From Swiss-Prot, chain A:
Family statement: Belongs to the MCM family.
Anything else known: Present with 1690 molecules/cell in log phase SD medium. Early fractionation of eukaryotic MCM proteins yielded a variety of dimeric, trimeric and tetrameric complexes with unclear biological significance. Specifically a MCM467 subcomplex is shown to have in vitro helicase activity which is inhibited by the MCM2 subunit. The MCM2-7 hexamer is the proposed physiological active complex.
Protein name: DNA replication licensing factor MCM2
Quaternary assembly: Component of the MCM2-7 complex. The complex forms a toroidal hexameric ring with the proposed subunit order MCM2-MCM6-MCM4-MCM7-MCM3-MCM5; loaded onto DNA, forms a head-head double hexamer.
Task of the protein: Acts as a component of the MCM2-7 complex (MCM complex) which is the putative replicative helicase essential for 'once per cell cycle' DNA replication initiation and elongation in eukaryotic cells. The active ATPase sites in the MCM2-7 ring are formed through the interaction surfaces of two neighboring subunits such that a critical structure of a conserved arginine finger motif is provided in trans relative to the ATP-binding site of the Walker A box of the adjacent subunit.
Localization annotation: Nucleus
Curated annotation (Swiss-Prot), chain B:
Lineage of producing organism: Eukaryota, Fungi, Dikarya, Ascomycota, Saccharomycotina
Quaternary assembly: DNA polymerase epsilon is a heterotetramer consisting of POL2, DPB2, DPB3 and DPB4.
Residues at which [4Fe-4S] cluster binds: 416, 419, 431, 433
Localization annotation: Nucleus
Purpose: Catalytic component of the DNA polymerase epsilon complex which participates in chromosomal DNA replication. Required during synthesis of the leading DNA strands at the replication fork, binds at/or near replication origins and moves along DNA with the replication fork. Has 3'-5' proofreading exonuclease activity that corrects errors arising during DNA replication.
Main location: nucleus
Motif (CysB motif): 416-433
Presence of keyword Nucleus: yes
GO cellular component, one term: nuclear replication fork
Range of the intact protein held here: 1701 to 2220 of 2222
GO biological process: base-excision repair; base-excision repair, gap-filling; DNA replication proofreading; DNA-templated DNA replication; double-strand break repair; double-strand break repair via nonhomologous end joining; error-prone translesion synthesis; gene conversion
Domain characteristics, as noted in the entry: The DNA polymerase activity domain resides in the N-terminal half of the protein, while the C-terminus is necessary for complexing subunits B and C.
Additional note from the record: In eukaryotes there are five DNA polymerases: alpha, beta, gamma, delta, and epsilon which are responsible for different reactions of DNA synthesis.
Full protein name: DNA polymerase epsilon catalytic subunit A
Curated annotation (Swiss-Prot), chain C:
Segments passing through the bilayer: none
Ranges spanned by the short sequence motif Arginine finger, renumbered to the chain: 31-34
Self-association state and partner proteins as the record states: Component of the MCM2-7 complex. The complex forms a toroidal hexameric ring with the proposed subunit order MCM2-MCM6-MCM4-MCM7-MCM3-MCM5; loaded onto DNA, forms a head-head double hexamer. Interacts with CSM1.
Function field: Acts as a component of the MCM2-7 complex (MCM complex) which is the putative replicative helicase essential for 'once per cell cycle' DNA replication initiation and elongation in eukaryotic cells. The active ATPase sites in the MCM2-7 ring are formed through the interaction surfaces of two neighboring subunits such that a critical structure of a conserved arginine finger motif is provided in trans relative to the ATP-binding site of the Walker A box of the adjacent subunit.
Protein name: Minichromosome maintenance protein 5
Taxonomic path: Eukaryota, Fungi, Dikarya, Ascomycota, Saccharomycotina
Compartments where located: Nucleus
Additional notes on this entry: Present with 10300 molecules/cell in log phase SD medium.
Family stated for the protein in its record: Belongs to the MCM family.
From Swiss-Prot, chain D:
Entry GO terms, CC: cytoplasm; epsilon DNA polymerase complex; nuclear replication fork; nucleus
Role noted for this protein: As accessory component of the DNA polymerase epsilon complex participates in chromosomal DNA replication. It is required during synthesis of the leading and lagging DNA strands at the replication fork and binds at/or near replication origins and moves along DNA with the replication fork. It has 3'-5' proofreading exonuclease activity that correct errors arising during DNA replication. It is also involved in DNA synthesis during DNA repair.
Other noteworthy facts: Present with 3110 +/- 251 molecules/cell in log phase SD medium.
Gene Ontology terms for molecular function: DNA binding
The name this protein goes by in its record: DNA polymerase epsilon subunit B
Any GO BP: DNA-templated DNA replication maintenance of fidelity
Domain of life: Eukaryota
Phosphoserine: modified positions: 474
Length: 95, 472, 250, 548
């Protein structure tokens, strides 16, 4: 029954996060990142909205989705740069 | 041949810009402020295929002439001293005969190379260059206490002087910095001691030069000047506490905890009062946004820019980023705004209009001058001596800058869209590959430059410049 | 008409690898195709910001309004009207060429064929993307379709220039895209030594002087031009201004 | 009104106006037009409302006056203006114009017709920066020049053999060909010809050029030779500049366009033409032309040295008693270029330049006849305020700005007719078109002459022949003479003016005429302890006078 609706989302925050993940990535490592991951973040936010049986996405769901995505991206790097990227990407998932 | 116009000569004629290095940030270590003198003469004395070359025989002849000049000047000759002092101004001034633009460009390029070599030598030891210029250099010292940099600074001085490349340089120390908040040449604040003394605690005086405060509302500038002093005091206290205890540094981590709650309550009160008294007619005087030359931002709510500047000053810590971001989000939560909104992004409230190499005849002193960012009663007078400058000379130099800009735009080259290859035909529809030509100099840049020229000519009384504008 | 979608071997094109071992299609299959476009991914964060903005807008919450205005301001037409118009144009019009267009096409084909031979004699392997008379027929068909769009009974230079532009794009993007694939390198380091030695930072020299000097020496013109434009491709110490005459060292 | 005006009632005059202006001719009479007719009736109260012929015939005259303006479908407050025109209808007709206000006209090759271009000043805002040309203008400028030259070549009587485009030379060899294009140097350093189709190389080792021309890079040349596909060398056997055309045959291809239109102008809405008044103005010019004399001086008259002022005072003494119509002063007025002053102890260059014109206002106080009767024309030279301030006395942009108004605040008040223009300027007489252009030509064409491997009256012959065959004031590339991207149409000799004032300090004085155009070559104002100035009679006669 429940269908979430997505109206009030931070355009700039998500856009800059996607720009940053386009940065690094193949330019510095090997993991590929494309537009599909943006829709993945959005689908994860919608799922988190579905968790609460709510028809509209709040800010906490977007924060949780972005935290999950950035954590999954960070924990798949070489141990040399994991700490550096962890401290670098700490500004978007501040909470 | 010199009567004919040429592209290379015109390019080497108007390329008088001198670059500089500025590494903004927040520093807790001691910083040394130094000045360099006699750079041009040392550069001259020190150091077929290339078509842009200046005749090397003449260069050697003048090098020997300057060497004998220096030798005679050392042995108590006032005339040789004045001649050496005036040599640089002779080089710059085209009015003097036997003048060649190639020689001036050669000397300028050599001076830039010598300055970068000096920067390389300085960075070889333990140092960090904060600001670089033809006249001033700021060096960060690895040590923490000013009293412990006496022999160390003297050692760098002696080592630099003994270098054969820098045998004729004159170097002097002006100030010692205990705690510095540096973001720009016209925007800094910190605690400084003039000269370190023996057996006695040094005298510490706080300074604050901030053209940013001039763009705030008349009623919030007292709040700015109070809270900035408060945060500087808190920073000094926490650094002293850390030094008492013994990319992260614990000298500053934990300083915003001292004033967070009073700042929150003060911002709540200020927002309430602004909400209540913004629409009143007789209170509208204090909420008037001042206008200054070089201003380009149109915005409405003054308290927003107050808090934006207050947070941007703190953000230069580069080591307590998360704490500052948390405090910024908490402050923005008082407003009905969000963390990453475009309206909550700080920008530069003023533009820049710099005139390179203005000459003070009374000193043979050479320096740039910014007509927009610089404060008054300094555009009209020399930096070292307090001699008033001629005004029609300033207007003529500004008009020369404007006309040189227009000519440079007119004689620019064309660049393709997809590939960045240059146009190599006099008449071709587009690149052999995909894409169409575009100019290397965008139109909006020169439009904005003419706009700021209009603002400058309107703020002060410059009728020659206004006549020059009106003729277009 | 066949519209085919394909992915190169090893996922991303891997331009460091040779073009020959990136495409597994034979010469026979590629010749029948006449518009092949290589869609490479790029990263400059500005196109990325624009794409992110476009996707966040194209979500159903906003586009459902904005796209509507495209039928209200006359900028775009609905799909069914486009279908009706295209079937009507297919049924009715069938353009024809003119002798000036024929001359232009002949000259352009000769030029591209000579360029292909020039690339082949250097690369000393056969081109992975061929240029044949089928391509000339392809450009003719593109011109005819462009004229057919506006129901013109005759095709003129206006459509010919656009067809040639599209063909040049689809040629330089795939066929002539880095034909070298990456005397050997011994002269390259030798040539890199002299320009650092003989030409300091901030000064400049004429291209003719350098070409004369290194044709007089053993480098010759073939090695110098490639080396010069690749030192430019490195783009960290070499800059061209003032047409192809001023060799400025940044 | 009349001597005894009577205040009318508009309703009872309404039918009389409406019938005539809505059934016979005219349309859409406004209320203000009705009021204008009301006051005109007040000026015709004599037996009105009972007088038939005079009122209707004056309305017909109103139609014959207001039909020619725009289209005449509305009458605003201007109704009083057409009434005053009726009263006033019951030397002038000449104009001077600079390159800034010249009408813009593009060219289209596929339609073989000139196209009017809307002026950025008149429709755009222009508040901050409206004079900056756009990027593609320089791309299209050489295209336009090549289009005009190709059209001139194709219209020649001899050429109806056919030329061949460059790009069509790839597949053929060992065959002779004819082609034209821009001549210049490639990036490599060889001689090449450029065409919109493409470019080729040039072989010069066995070229016999047509004598009488200055073969200079940047000039259109007709090239005849044999292609060789062994390399890319086009072995040229002869080279010749394209021939020119006369004014009448040039105009007749476009009827008589109002390019330099003083009687009428064209716009984006429509195109204009006129030839009925041309003969009337020609016959008007044929009389009292000796009375309408205009005199010019030499080049580079310096306003700092005493000798020039003394000679000028003598000249003004001789010229005061018989004031001519136009008095043109050409050349730089200061012997030293003006630029930024690095010394605050001495007199500033700008102040010296300003003072250099104040004394002229004093010297003009004792020649009230010349000031009162003769107009003043001033043309900037090489090192005036705007140019020398950046070019430092060297060559620079051709569309030179006029003398700044802040430095000429006393000439405009002492004299009643003073005009400052660009370096190239246009004057439009009743049946004459004259351009004045001040720069150096002999040295420019002497130093940059092409070398072909193999009594002073001939040099000016070659110069005139080349400048007329090429049909452009600046037959040079962008490297030598930088030109503003849009104003280049002002430098084109497409209308081929009747008389040209070739001011050259490096060439002797001459009075040649060729190809239907007459050229005058004023020299330097002072030379070998002599002063010289020349006057031209509009009857194709010249006089040279000198005063020691
Ligand atoms: Zn001074
Ligand atoms: Zn391109």
């Amino acid at each position: 029954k429940i269908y979430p609706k997505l109206h009030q989302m931070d355009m700039d925050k998500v856009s800059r996060v996607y720009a940053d993940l386009r940065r690094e990535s193949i330019s510095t490592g090997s993991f590929p990142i494309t537009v599909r991951h943006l829709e993945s973040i959005l689908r994860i936010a919608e799922s988190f909205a579905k968790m609460r049986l709510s028809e509209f996405v709040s800010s906490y769901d977007l924060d949780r989705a972005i935290k999950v995505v950035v954590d999954s991206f960070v924990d798949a790097q070489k141990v040399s740069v994991r700490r550096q990227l962890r401290r670098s990407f700490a500004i978007y998932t501040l909470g | 041949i010199q009567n004919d116009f040429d592209l290379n000569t015109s390019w080497i004629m108007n390329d008088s810009e001198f670059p500089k290095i500025n590494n903004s940030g927040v520093y807790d270590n001691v910083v040394l402020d130094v000045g360099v003198d006699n750079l041009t003469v040392n550069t001259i004395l020190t150091s077929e295929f290339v078509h842009d070359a200046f005749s090397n025989d003449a260069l050697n002849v003048l090098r020997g002439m300057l060497k004998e000049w220096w030798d005679e000047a050392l042995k108590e000759n006032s005339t040789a001293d004045l001649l050496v002092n005036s040599l640089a101004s002779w080089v710059q001034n085209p009015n003097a005969k036997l003048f060649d633009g190639l020689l001036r460009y050669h000397v300028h390029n050599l001076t830039k190379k010598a300055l970068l070599q000096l920067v390389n030598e300085f960075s070889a030891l333990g140092s960090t260059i904060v600001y670089a210029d033809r006249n001033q250099i700021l060096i960060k010292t690895n040590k923490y206490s000013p009293e412990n940099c006496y022999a160390y600074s003297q050692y760098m001085m002696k080592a630099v002087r003994t270098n054969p490349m820098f045998s004729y340089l004159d170097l002097n120390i002006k100030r010692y910095w205990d705690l510095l908040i540096w973001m720009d040449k016209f925007n800094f604040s910190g605690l400084a001691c003039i000269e370190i003394e023996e057996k006695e605690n040094q005298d510490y005086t706080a300074v604050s030069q901030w053209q940013l405060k001039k763009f705030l509302s008349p009623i919030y500038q007292p709040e700015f000047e109070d809270w900035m002093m408060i945060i500087l005091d808190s920073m000094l206290k926490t650094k002293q506490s850390y030094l008492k205890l013994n990319s992260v540094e614990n000298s500053l981590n934990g300083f915003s905890h001292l004033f967070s709650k009073p700042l929150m309550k003060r911002v709540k009160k200020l927002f309430k009062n602004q909400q209540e008294f913004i629409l009143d007619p007789q209170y509208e005087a204090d909420y008037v946004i001042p206008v200054l030359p070089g201003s380009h931002l149109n915005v409405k709510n003054p308290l927003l820019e107050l808090v934006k500047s207050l947070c941007h000053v703190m953000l230069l810590s580069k080591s307590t980023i998360l704490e500052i971001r948390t405090l910024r989000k908490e402050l923005l939560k008082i407003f009905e705004l969000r963390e990453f909104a475009k309206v909550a992004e700080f920008k530069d409230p003023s533009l820049s209009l710099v005139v390179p190499d203005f000459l003070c005849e009374y000193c043979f002193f050479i320096s740039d001058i910014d007509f927009c960012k610089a404060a008054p009663e300094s555009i009209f007078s020399c930096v070292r001596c307090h001699k008033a400058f001629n005004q029609v000379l300033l207007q003529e130099h500004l008009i020369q800058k404007l006309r040189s800009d227009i000519e440079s735009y007119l004689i620019q080259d064309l660049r393709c869209s997809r590939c960045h290859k240059v146009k190599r035909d006099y008449m071709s529809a587009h690149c052999p590959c995909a894409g169409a030509w575009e100019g290397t100099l965008p139109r909006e840049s020169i439009v904005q430059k003419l706009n700021v020229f209009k603002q400058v000519a309107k703020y002060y009384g410059f009728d020659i410049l206004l006549s020059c504008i009106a003729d277009l | 008409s066949v519209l085919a979608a394909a992915n190169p071997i090893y996922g991303r094109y891997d331009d460091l690898k040779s073009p020959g071992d990136n495409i597994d299609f034979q010469t026979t299959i590629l010749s029948r195709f006449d518009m092949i476009f290589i869609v490479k991914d790029d990263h400059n964060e500005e196109r990325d910001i624009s794409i992110a903005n476009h996707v966040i807008n194209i979500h159903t919450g906003n586009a459902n309004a904005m796209q509507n205005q495209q039928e209200e301001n006359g900028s775009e037409i609905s799909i069914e009207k486009m279908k009706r118009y295209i079937t009507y144009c297919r049924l009715k019009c069938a353009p024809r060429l003119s002798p000036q267009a024929a001359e232009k096409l002949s000259s352009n084909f000769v030029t591209i064929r000579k360029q292909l031979l020039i690339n082949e004699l250097e690369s000393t392997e056969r081109s992975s993307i061929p240029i044949t008379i089928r391509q000339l027929e392809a450009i003719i068909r593109i011109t005819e379709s462009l004229a057919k769009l506006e129901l013109s009974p005759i095709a003129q230079e206006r459509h010919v220039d656009e067809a040639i532009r599209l063909f040049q794009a689809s040629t330089m993007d795939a066929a002539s895209q880095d034909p070298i694939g990456g005397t050997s390198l011994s002269e390259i380091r030798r040539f890199e030594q002299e320009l650092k030695r003989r030409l300091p930072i901030g000064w400049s020299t004429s291209y003719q002087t350098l070409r004369r000097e290194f044709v007089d020496t053993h480098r010759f013109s073939q090695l110098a031009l490639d080396k010069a434009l690749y030192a430019l491709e490195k783009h960290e110490t070499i800059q061209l201004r003032h047409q192809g005459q001023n060799i400025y060292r940044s | 009104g009349n001597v005894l005006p009577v205040k009318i009632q508009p309703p009872l005059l309404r039918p009389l106006a409406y019938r005539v202006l809505s059934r016979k001719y005219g349309l859409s009479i406004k209320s203000d037009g009705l009021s204008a007719l009301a006051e005109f009736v007040g000026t015709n109260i004599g037996a009105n409302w009972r007088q038939g012929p005079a009122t209707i015939k004056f309305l017909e005259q109103f139609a014959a006056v207001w039909k020619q303006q725009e289209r005449g479908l509305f009458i605003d407050q201007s109704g009083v203006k057409e009434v005053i025109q009726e009263m006033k209808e019951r030397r002038d007709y000449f104009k001077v114009i600079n390159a800034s206000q010249q009408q813009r006209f593009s060219y289209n090759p596929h339609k073989m017709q000139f196209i009017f271009v809307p002026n950025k000043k008149q429709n755009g805002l222009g508040g901050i920066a409206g004079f900056l040309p756009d990027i593609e203008d320089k791309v299209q400028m050489f295209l336009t020049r090549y289009y005009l030259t190709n059209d001139r070549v194709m219209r020649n009587e001899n050429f109806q053999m056919s030329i061949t485009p460059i790009k069509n030379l790839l597949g053929r060899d060992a065959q002779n060909f004819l082609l034209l294009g821009l001549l210049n140097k490639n990036f490599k350093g060889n001689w090449s010809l450029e065409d919109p189709s493409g470019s080729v190389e040039i072989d010069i080792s066995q070229t016999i050029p047509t004598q009488g021309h200055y073969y200079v890079p940047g000039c259109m040349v007709l090239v005849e030779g044999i292609y060789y596909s062994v390399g890319n060398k086009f072995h040229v056997t002869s080279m010749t500049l394209p021939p020119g055309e006369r004014r009448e045959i040039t105009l007749e291809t476009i009827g008589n366009l109002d390019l330099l239109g003083i009687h009428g102008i064209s716009n984006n809405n429509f195109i204009a033409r006129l030839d009925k008044d041309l003969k009337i103005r020609l016959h008007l010019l044929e009389k009292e032309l000796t009375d309408h004399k205009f005199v010019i001086l030499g080049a580079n008259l310096f306003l700092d040295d005493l000798k020039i002022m003394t000679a000028l005072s003598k000249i003004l003494q001789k010229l005061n008693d018989d004031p001519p119509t136009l008095l043109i002063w050409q050349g730089s007025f200061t012997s030293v270029p003006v630029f930024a002053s690095m010394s605050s102890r001495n007199i500033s260059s700008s102040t010296q330049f300003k003072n250099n014109f104040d004394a002229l206002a004093t010297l003009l106080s004792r020649f009230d006849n010349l000031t009162e009767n003769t107009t003043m024309i001033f043309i900037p030279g090489p090192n005036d305020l705007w140019g020398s301030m950046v070019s430092l006395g060297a060559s620079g942009t051709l569309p030179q700005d006029p003398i700044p108004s802040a430095f000429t605040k006393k000439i405009n008040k002492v004299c009643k007719n003073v005009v400052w223009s660009s370096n190239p300027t246009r004057i439009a007489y009743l049946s004459q078109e004259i351009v004045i252009f001040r720069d150096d030509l002999s040295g420019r064409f002497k130093r940059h002459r092409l070398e072909f491997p193999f009594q002073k009256v001939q040099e000016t012959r070659k110069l005139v022949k080349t400048i007329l065959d090429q049909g452009h004031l600046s037959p040079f590339l962008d490297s030598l003479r930088p030109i503003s991207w849009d104003l280049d149409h002002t430098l084109t000799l497409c209308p081929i003016p009747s008389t040209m004032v070739l001011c050259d300090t490096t060439s002797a004085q001459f009075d040649l005429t060729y190809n239907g155009c007459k050229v005058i070559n004023p020299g330097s104002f002072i030379h070998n302890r002599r002063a010289r100035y020349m006057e031209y009679v509009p009857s194709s006669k010249k006089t040279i006078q000198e005063e020691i």
